[PDB]
A paper describes a structure:
In R. erythropolis, the lactonase QsdA has been identified as the only lactonase. We named the incriminated gene qsdR (quorum-sensing degradation regulation) which codes for a transcriptional regulator of the TetR/FabR family. QsdR protein possesses a DNA-binding domain at the N-terminus and a regulatory domain at the C-terminus. The DNA-binding domain permits the protein to bind DNA inducing genes activation or repression under its control.
QsdR shares low sequence identity (around 20%) with regulatory proteins with known three dimensional structures. Thus the structure of QsdR at 2.4 Å resolution was solved using sulfur SAD method. A better resolution structure at 1.9 Å of QsdR from a different crystallization condition was determined by molecular replacement (using the sulfur-SAD structure as model) with two identical molecules in the asymmetric unit (root mean square deviation (rmsd) of 0.07 Å for 181 Cα atoms). Each molecule of QsdRwt comprises 186 residues and is composed of 11 α helices, 3 of them corresponding to the DNA-binding domain, and the others to the regulatory domain. The DNA-binding domain (residues 2 to 41) forms the N terminus domain while the regulatory domain (residues 47 to 186) constitutes the C terminus. These two domains are connected by two residues, Glycine 45 and Asparagine 46. Each monomer in the asymmetric unit forms a dimer by the crystallographic symmetry. The dimer interface covers 995 A2 per subunit involving 19 residues located in helices α7, α 9 and α10 and two loops, one between α7 and α8 and the other between α9 and α10. Therefore, the dimeric structure of QsdRwt is the functional form in solution in line with results from gel filtration chromatography (molecular mass estimates at 44 kDa). The regulatory domain of QsdR presents a half hydrophobic/half polar cavity suggesting that QsdR can bind molecules having both hydrophobic and polar groups such as NAHL.
Residue numbers in the entry: 2 to 189
Write the structure that this text describes.
């Protein structure tokens, strides 16, 4: 596809996600005015397209948290992650998707793919900017630490899909702190 053809496809698929409608590839092809074969050629299967849709929504979440987060260094990184995780936890569109297709979502979110790659590359960028600002001391590359932060956190954010009671945000933050070489002094 052209960048434009793919954009129309993702934008339409994203509206279905936001409207809490399942990603019906036939409904999508009809809305685009294209055949099912043309649609597959443009975006791949339903899972590949949903991953792209969710990865773009993930980027928007991260960017908003980065502009709204306070402080510098590990305290800023902790704030961005806390904000992103709580925003994801309160998502009604995600909630509707996870209730209907938990196994598809576990795969898209917690297996290497679209969601983990954008989360890791935006985290890597956050780490590099903090190192560039003289606010963070790291021994491993931002790419290595960014991927590690995402991998350690995501199973906690999505803990109810894995058989647990609730999103384990505080535990994920404790792991980020430990990875950054800082302490979290909990009370109450
Ligand atoms: Ca184009």
């Amino acid at each position: 596809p052209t960048d434009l053809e793919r954009r129309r496809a993702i934008d339409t698929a994203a509206s279905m996600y936001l409207a809490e409608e399942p990603l019906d590839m036939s409904l999508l092809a009809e809305r685009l005015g294209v055949g099912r074969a043309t649609l597959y050629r443009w975006v791949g299967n339903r899972d590949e397209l949903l991953g792209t849709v969710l990865a773009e929504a993930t980027e928007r979440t991260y960017r908003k948290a980065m502009s709204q987060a306070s402080g510098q260094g590990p305290e800023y990184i902790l704030d961005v992650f806390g904000r992103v995780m709580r925003s994801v936890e309160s998502s009604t569109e995600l909630r509707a998707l996870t209730k209907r297709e938990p196994m598809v979502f576990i795969k898209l979110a917690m297996m290497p793919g679209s969601i983990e790659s954008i989360s890791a590359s935006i985290t890597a960028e956050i780490l590099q900017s903090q190192v560039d600002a003289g606010q963070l001391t790291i021994t491993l590359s931002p790419q290595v630490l960014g991927e590690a932060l995402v991998r350690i956190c995501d199973v906690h954010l999505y803990a109810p899909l894995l058989g647990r009671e609730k999103a384990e945000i505080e535990t994920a933050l404790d792991l980020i702190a430990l990875l950054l070489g800082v302490t979290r002094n909990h009370h109450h």
